[PDB]
């Protein structure tokens, strides 16, 4: 097969490592790979020095000085797979050097203290917390600076806002309400904006004349003259304004906290925050944030500039000071690292908390080791973040692509500190700057929306969470192959142009060519074109860039497309699309699906389990292949060798294919011939058909592995033993259970068979007087033990592939308490494409299989080749996605021209070029037909008649020439197959790429007769093997209520759900074929009544005449 790529825009740089944001972040986060000597001291090391120098001086005896030397972590407790087999947490051990000083002669250094086991990152980008691989999703929020936004309700004047992160650390606001007051709020209650200026050193005279020479708001600042006449005293007066009831005397203590070290930020001195300063407001910053502690007299080059631009924003045009939040030059993205470092520093504070208490507890000098350190805080802190933080979820690995996307989708919700869920219409929208930084489509449909959205193609987090987007430089009318990842703020300063601009190389080609100043479409001249976009891909995300003609599909319907991919299930037969975008390769490779060759060499051994290659450097490595592993979602992950024995391999060539790769190509679903016409009723508006022939060759088949597990608990009634002994009825059910207790490998287990046998005790504490007579009659000597064996739950099972058993003397496993021993039973099963399933193309047409028609009578082409699937036309008019109809046309060509193609995003193939390829396919189609010996059908001509009368073929031309014309249109004549008659009117057909969507347990249906019930409420509930009842909701109630469905409504509220005595009698009755008794009171009411009785209220039922009646049959009366 051949590959022709149409769109020509010089892709200047490759797409960044999709995983680059997670990998690198965690790299800089934990600099452990390089000695402490290496300078990058952010994250771990930074947080360490941030809280390591613990200074505790006087309250009794002090002069405590504990300081950090070097942090080193290195030998993993166990390995990856070992941590998945055994429920373990893959974490490296960390213990840095520590030495505590004394005010007396002596400094004891207790070198290591293994406090905290921190998780590690896998080579791909995911973790292993407990048994399952997890993902740390990034997040967004406002960065730290000072801005001036318009007043809430009053249309009047705007107010200032100083934002200092960490959380602890004031949040200032400057608002003037002139009838007599001004308002500057730290935690809440206003004082002046001047009471603070005066403390630092700004007098009413100098302040007013310099900040207010241009404005009049200065009259609210000189207002309260009475407090403004005393300097250093206003320092103590402000302290008074805070409210606990604290000592008036505290030299420069709390003025320090909102001064130099903690609350304000240790974000790199210079570009972290000072950036948002110099450009947006105020000119200088002395010391990272408003910081100083040299003379006791503080300096604030930030507090006057915020109100200076408030006075400036509210008066005129010093510039236009209205900040569009959403401009990405403002809201920052929190990488994994940052999120772990924060919790790490939260744990450090918790440790430093308790250590300070021990500086006083320790008798004398020997207090370095255990006297100062307790691993309790750190452990729980970190652990809590990776196991219970609302941000870590199941890696979506339907197909590696799925996981990669799940990893780059941008979120708002998080710590809880940043943004909550019922607040955000301005956040949710896709801002301008989200360009090449956040997908505008990856936003999942559903309640949680807009808050989550994967990043774009070339998008890459620079140094500080500013998704910079690539933009190439263009000096004069000359465009460069040079690129600048730019901050979202900086982007507005320039006039940038699109990539579609005609270019001769470095030369712009049209005088009036498109460019966008600042979120505004602008027709610029080649002379003003300062920068140009890098490529159409950057605009969107990875998951989206996999869409063929995304240009012809409606943004909303495309979303579904991108989402659908994330739900693609791995088929044994993986086939790349007949029409691709260009990133299928990049996907599987940046993802770790396929196994690539490191260096060039030759192949030595090609096993089904390993391919030992021999590199030409004189080295040979054994590459194991993950045979069959259990994905978190239960999909199969096998690496299928694709290289034969003894083969010279190129550097970076696939040796084995990933779970869903055909040949180094991403593959989820297969390319099938498809006729786009309506059948009886099978393909409904959204519903679609399928050819039995597709099942014949395993075209739509996938593998699913499940991990059933059971434990031998320790009851005070007697240990639960695991043995081949299943106490009560047959040997026929004990065959598969070959090994004493365990099930034999390679055994076909159907629903209801014994996977594992276990024996517990019959009652709670007492035997049974009735069961005692039954046992004795036929044979008293009966193993008193009850049958509590793991059985195949309804639904299905397959063949037992693997079994795991952990007995008494555990190797290095963590057996829970009470748990004597566990027994895992992996069962696999082949799933063949059936009616219930759902499939969908990359564009948006989604649909379920309605009927598996036999090849016998489905639509077939003049030549015996029959169609695979029949898609309903109606589903494409109302819905706007002609890209699909465009994919089927080029596909048609590829079928008879035996070749694949690559149509870029907006630059790809064009209608003329396709008609061309189609012209080439006609000869292969009809040319072979001419030579093979035959011409045109009565049928083929009949359809032409109706076709000329339609307006598809120029009347007066030969059938040979007409059919060509008609073929170019993308449609060919087809016979019914059931009658052999043709289909009056040409019907398009082609090679359309369709994928199979993941069959969740929501697919595998649920039908419940009788089963469990809830403890407190007496409503039906299931879970494991008993389905669980459906909800009847008031809306449905109303439905029956509308109807005269009295009893039907009663039944639902009584006999079927809550009437404890009712259901029981109900059942028996039906068993008997009797007429169901009359409903007793529903437990829900009873539980209501009492719940209400819990509260003062007394609710009593009454008779004809206001007199009692009893709901509680008789347990309410006392004694």
């Amino acid at each position: 097969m051949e590959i022709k790529r149409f769109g020509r825009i010089r892709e200047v740089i490759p797409l960044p490592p999709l995983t680059e944001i997670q990998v690198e972040s965690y790299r800089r986060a934990l600099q452990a790979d390089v000695p402490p000597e290496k300078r990058e001291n952010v994250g771990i090391q930074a947080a360490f020095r941030e809280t390591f120098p613990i200074e505790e001086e006087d309250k009794g005896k002090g002069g405590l000085v504990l300081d950090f030397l070097e942090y080193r972590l290195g030998e993993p407790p166990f390995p990856q797979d070992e941590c998945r087999e055994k429920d373990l947490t893959y974490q490296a051990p960390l213990y840095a050097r520590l030495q505590l000083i004394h005010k007396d002669t002596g400094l004891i250094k207790e070198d290591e203290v293994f406090l905290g086991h921190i998780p590690l990152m896998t080579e791909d980008g995911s973790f292993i917390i407990n048994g399952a691989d997890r993902v740390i999703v990034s997040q967004i929020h406002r960065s730290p600076g000072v801005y001036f936004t318009p007043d809430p309700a009053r249309p009047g004047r705007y107010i200032a806002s100083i934002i200092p992160l960490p959380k602890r650390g004031p949040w200032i606001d400057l608002e003037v309400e002139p009838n007599g007051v001004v308002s500057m709020k730290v935690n809440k209650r206003k004082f002046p904006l001047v009471l603070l200026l005066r403390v630092l050193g700004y007098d009413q005279e100098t302040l007013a004349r310099e900040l207010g020479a241009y404005g009049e708001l200065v009259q609210g600042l000189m207002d309260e003259s009475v407090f403004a006449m005393r300097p250093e005293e206003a320092l103590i007066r402000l302290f008074t304004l805070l409210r606990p009831g604290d000592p008036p005397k505290r030299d420069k203590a709390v003025a320090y906290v909102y001064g130099l070290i903690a609350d304000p930020r240790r974000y790199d001195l210079g570009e972290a925050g000072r950036y948002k300063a110099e450009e947006k407001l105020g000119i200088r910053l002395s010391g990272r944030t408003l910081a100083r502690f040299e003379d006791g007299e503080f300096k604030d080059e930030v507090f006057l500039p915020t109100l200076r631009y408030l006075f400036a924003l509210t008066a005129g045009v010093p510039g236009h000071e209205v900040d569009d939040i959403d401009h990405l030059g403002n809201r920052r993205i929190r990488t994994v690292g940052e999120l772990m470092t924060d919790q790490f520093r939260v744990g450090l504070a918790r440790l430093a908390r308790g250590v300070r208490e021990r500086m006083l507890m320790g008798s004398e000098d020997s207090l370095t080791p255990a006297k100062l350190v307790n691993s309790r805080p750190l452990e729980a802190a970190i652990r809590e973040f990776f196991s219970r933080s609302q941000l870590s979820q199941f890696k979506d690995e339907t197909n590696p692509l799925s996981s990669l996307r799940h990893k780059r989708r941008i979120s708002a919700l998080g710590p809880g500190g940043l943004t909550r869920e019922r607040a955000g219409f301005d956040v949710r929208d896709v801002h301008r700057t989200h360009y090449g930084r956040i997908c505008p489509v990856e936003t999942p449909e559903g309640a949680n929306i807009g808050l989550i959205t994967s990043l774009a193609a070339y998008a890459r987090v620079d140094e500080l969470g500013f998704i910079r987007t690539p933009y190439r430089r263009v000096v004069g009318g000359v465009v460069t192959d040079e690129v600048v990842y730019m901050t979202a703020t900086e982007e507005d300063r320039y006039t940038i142009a699109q990539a579609n601009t005609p270019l001769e190389g470095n030369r712009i080609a049209a005088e009036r060519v498109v460019a966008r100043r600042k979120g505004e479409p602008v027709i610029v001249s080649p002379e003003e074109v300062e920068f140009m976009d890098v490529s159409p891909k950057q605009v969107f995300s990875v998951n989206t860039n996999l869409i063929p003609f995304l240009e012809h599909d409606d943004a909303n319907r495309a979303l579904m497309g991108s989402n659908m991919q994330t739900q693609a299930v791995p088929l044994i037969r993986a086939q790349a699309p007949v029409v691709m975008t260009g990133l299928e390769e990049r996907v599987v490779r940046d993802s770790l699906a396929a196994l690539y060759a490191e260096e060039d060499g030759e192949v030595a051994k090609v096993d089904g389990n390993r391919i030992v290659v021999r590199y030409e450097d004189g080295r040979l490595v054994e590459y194991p292949l993950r045979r069959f592993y259990r994905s978190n979602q239960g999909t199969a992950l096998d690496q299928r060798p694709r290289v034969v024995v003894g083969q010279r391999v190129r550097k970076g060539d696939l040796l084995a294919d990933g779970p869903a790769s055909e040949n180094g190509f991403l593959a989820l679903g297969q390319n099938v011939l498809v006729a786009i016409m309506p059948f009886d009723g099978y393909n409904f508006e959204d519903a679609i058909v399928i050819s039995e022939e597709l099942l014949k060759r395993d075209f739509y088949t996938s593998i699913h592995i499940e991990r059933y597990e059971i434990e031998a608990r320790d009851t005070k009634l007697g240990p639960e033993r695991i043995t081949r002994d299943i106490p009560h009825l047959s040997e026929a059910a004990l065959r598969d259970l070959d090994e004493e207790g365990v099930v034999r490998i390679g055994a076909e287990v159907k629903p209801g068979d014994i996977l594992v046998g276990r024996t517990s005790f019959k009652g709670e504490s007492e035997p049974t007087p009735e069961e005692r007579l039954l046992r004795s009659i036929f044979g008293e000597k009966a193993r008193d033990v009850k049958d509590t064996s793991l059985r195949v739950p309804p639904g299905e099972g397959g063949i037992v592939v693997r079994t795991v058993r952990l007995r008494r003397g555990d190797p290095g496993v963590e057996l829970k308490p009470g748990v004597r021993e566990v027994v895992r039973v992996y069962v696999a099963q082949k799933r063949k494409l059936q009616v219930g399933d759902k499939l969908a193309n990359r564009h948006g047409n989604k649909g379920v299989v309605a009927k598996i028609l036999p090849v016998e009578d489905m639509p077939h082409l003049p030549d015996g080749t029959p169609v695979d699937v029949i898609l309903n036309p109606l589903g494409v008019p109302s819905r706007m996605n002609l890209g699909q109809i465009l994919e089927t046309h080029l596909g048609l060509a590829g079928y008879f021209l035996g070749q694949r193609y690559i149509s870029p995003i907006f630059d790809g193939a064009k209608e003329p070029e396709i008609k061309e390829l189609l012209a080439q396919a006609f000869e292969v189609y009809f040319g072979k037909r001419k030579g093979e010996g035959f011409g045109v059908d009565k049928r083929e001509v009949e359809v032409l008649r109706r076709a000329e009368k339609l307006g598809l073929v120029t009347p007066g031309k030969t059938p040979e020439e007409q059919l060509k014309e008609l073929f170019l249109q993308g449609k060919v004549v087809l016979y019914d197959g059931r009658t052999g008659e043709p289909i009056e009117g040409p019907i398009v057909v082609g090679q359309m790429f369709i994928m199979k969507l993941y069959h969740m347990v929501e697919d595998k249906m649920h039908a419940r007769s009788t089963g469990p019930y809830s403890l407190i409420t007496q409503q039906p509930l299931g879970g494991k093997a008993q389905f669980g009842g459906q909800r009847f909701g008031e809306m449905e109630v109303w439905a029956l209520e509308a109807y005269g469905a009295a009893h039907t409504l009663q039944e639902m509220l009584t006999l079927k759900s809550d009437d404890i005595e009712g259901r029981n009698a109900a059942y028996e009755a039906i068993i008997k074929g009797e007429d169901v008794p009359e409903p007793s009171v529903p437990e829900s009411f009873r539980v209501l009544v009492k719940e209400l009785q819990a509260l003062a209220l007394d609710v009593q039922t009454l008779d004809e005449k206001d007199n009692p009646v009893d709901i509680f049959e008789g347990l309410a009366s006392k004694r």
Partner: protein, 95 residues
């Protein structure tokens, strides 16, 4: 749809009354013995694994088939509440 549902609907003063009648009829059909019917002979209710519906498939399916005929009588207070169940057990055998 169902046999002469409109014919049936016209036979009663209110929709929901027909429903109560059929139901109460199906109830007695089973309780006093399933042979408590008024039109079994020539053309009657039937199923096909054999023609066995003649004995006990669906109760109301009969009730409707009978009410469609002009044999039964439904009123607000036709026969005294308790004396009916007594005479009914006295004349109808199956248990």
């Amino acid at each position: 749809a169902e046999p002469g549902i409109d014919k049936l609907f016209g036979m009663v003063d209110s929709k929901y009354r027909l429903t109560v009648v059929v139901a109460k009829r199906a109830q007695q059909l089973l309780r006093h013995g399933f042979k408590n019917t008024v039109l079994e002979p020539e053309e009657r209710p039937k199923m096909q694994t054999l023609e066995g519906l003649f004995d006990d498939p669906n109760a109301v399916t009969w009730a409707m088939k009978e009410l469609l005929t002009g044999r039964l009588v439904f009123g607000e207070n036709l026969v005294p509440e308790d004396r009916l169940q007594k005479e009914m057990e006295r004349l109808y055998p199956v248990e």
